[PDB]
């Protein structure tokens with residue numbers, strides 16, 4: 412079945428809140444969340460429901476915007492770069508599992524371009 416979801420808290424990890432990390436939540440994630448193509452990325456891939464029994468055979472560092480949102484809400488990250496790496500893992504996993512031009516990939520590519528637009532300029 413499905414693996415445990417990625418952690419959204421960790422008391423051994425030091426927490427921080429920066430202007431940039433608040434912006435990644437309130438502006439970047441909250442607007443990506445509203446996109447019509449966001450729904451596949453709002454929660455961990457349910458390989459059992461989706462009948463993708465090889466998914467977690469191939470994807471060993473899963474990530475999703477639901478997990479990122481909870482991390483941001485928990486101040487789980489030390490800096491904005493940690494959060495941006497999670498977004499990139501999410502996108503890269505989708506391009507690894509799937510193939511150019513697949514419906515799910517076109518959705519990921521639309522979100523990625525939007526994501527790149529929004530982090531082009533972060534607050535001070």
Ligand SMILES: O=[N+]([O-])c1cc(Cl)c(O)c2ncccc12
Pocket residue numbers: 450451452456457461463504505508509515
């Ligand atoms: O939720 N989904 O339907 C979903 C999400 C993600 Cl992130 C994927 O890579 C998928 N790949 C193939 C089929 C469905 C997928």
